[PDB]
Design a protein around this ligand. Sequence first.
Ligand SMILES: CC1=N[C@@H]2[C@@H](O)[C@H](O)[C@@H](CO)O[C@@H]2S1
Length: 640
Amino acid sequence: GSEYRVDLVVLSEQKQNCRFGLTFHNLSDQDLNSWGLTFAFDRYILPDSVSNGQLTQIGSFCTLKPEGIVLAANHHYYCEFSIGSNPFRYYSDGFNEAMIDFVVDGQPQRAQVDVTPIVLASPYRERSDIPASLTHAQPLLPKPNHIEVSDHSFTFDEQAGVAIYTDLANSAKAWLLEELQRIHQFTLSSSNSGKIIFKSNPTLDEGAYKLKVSEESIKIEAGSSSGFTHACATLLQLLKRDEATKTMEAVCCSIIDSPRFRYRGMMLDCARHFHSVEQVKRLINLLAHYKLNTFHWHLTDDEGWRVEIKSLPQLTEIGAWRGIDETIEPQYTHLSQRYGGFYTQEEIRDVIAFAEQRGITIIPEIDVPGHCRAAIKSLPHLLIEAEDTTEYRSIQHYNDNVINPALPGSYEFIDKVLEEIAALFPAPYVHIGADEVPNGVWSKSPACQALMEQLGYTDYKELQGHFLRHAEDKLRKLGKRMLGWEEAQHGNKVSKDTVIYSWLSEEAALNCARQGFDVVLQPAQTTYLDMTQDYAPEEPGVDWANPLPLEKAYNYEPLAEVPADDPIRKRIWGIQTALWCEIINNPSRMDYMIFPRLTAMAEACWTEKQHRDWTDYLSRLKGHLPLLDLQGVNYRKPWK
Ligand SMILES: CC1=N[C@@H]2[C@@H](O)[C@H](O)[C@@H](CO)O[C@@H]2S1
């Protein structure tokens, strides 16, 4: 391939102390003058471990520059270094991207470096195996909580017609027709005497529906828009197309259906890598296919700010872009280009309208006071304290990325973001983040030192709560309830109205629910679509929780140990599944990580525990698979 190649090797592993060898090959014919290697690595390289040369790390962005000044043609450079971390189980744990800057007979140059797959020392031997499976006659995902199926069937064609006798169901019906068209080039038209009938039924509670196929008709009953949307999403899975006759076929059957959990979410990280309006919409559409109702928009982080804030235009003019010649350095991938994007308010209004039509509420996340590098680099005049010499390092290996809660500019900033955010997103909810604020922060900040004294705080976590409580008070004045990751509770300053997302595990969900907090369960051990799907080292993904095979994700039972009687269970809003995109930058990888485990997650959100069975779910998945092939969704194939 390239004339420049880097080989990385696990030399040795002693508990939490891994030594690597790095060999850089100048394969070409030229001597390389004053050169330097830059790559993307998500582990923190111990700076005093480096064997040979100068190495710099800013998050994932590393540069290696040799002690010497020339790399001879056909030779190479060698460097060793160590990290604290458990053994690498995956090729993904290696460098994601490498590139070289150099000079040749006097001329600056830049070239892509081939990155050889890391030579692993301790791959896994175990493999998750999925058994051979039948195709299920009704490949429905999530499994309806009641369904009776008859021996016969109702066949119908493009003149069958669609009847609607309540305006609650107008959105569902137009979503149904749209999807029949997009997925199947099957055009239904609306007629007063259609064989598909949307009628109202007020005994059915929110999101419940009834669907009955008979020899004459197909009837959809619900008391809510969302129940009509859910019914339509079952019907799209139920129908079976004959292209030779251009007919649809649905088994005669009776379905009565309702969700186990009110909160059935999916979060998408769009800060680490930007995804297009069309990709985001395409996802939201696929979310309503499985009857989820919440799209949690992670729009802000250290490596990107993706939501336009008219009153703070720097946040996108600067924070939406990173790379060598930008204010923000390259991160994770696209080392050689200017990389980014962002959503305008008009785009966002469009995505909201699109998702409303699908029964999906969108919750924006403005992540503070950690994970703020992009905001801080965009707005240094409001968010930097020049006099702070606290030396800290975050989980992602930044030391300059945390909001200062004693700076009046930090309140200027958040008051302005939240006002526009609140105005923009109709949902009565704003997620404030609050994850992974490093332990050392603010300890040497004069301004924080003075505010710590001024109101008698004894812990610097108390300063974080002070800020989040201000965010909550502003959100409340704007009509929004605040949501937060579990660490928002740190400092015990935020009110019992803050909805706690439990992600490290289910522990905070349990603890916080006992104390009167409403919680959402997003445990990393069972709900993170960025985790690898198998133990084979070729599986893309990360693994800090644990590998998450399909069967693990399916068999997740939320708070499996709180008895169903327990009034703790009244504080569970529901479940969320998340995709963080550190190593995800293209729709093909996205689809692979999300599907199919998302459908196992939608079934935990929706179906009652007593109707959930692994073997049964695999046969419904096997019969759904073709429907994702028709949509060109690049799911990881259970059976390959
Ligand atoms: C809350 C969370 N903040 C971290 C995120 O910034 C990372 O992307 C994710 C990767 O799994 O780990 C947790 S979850």
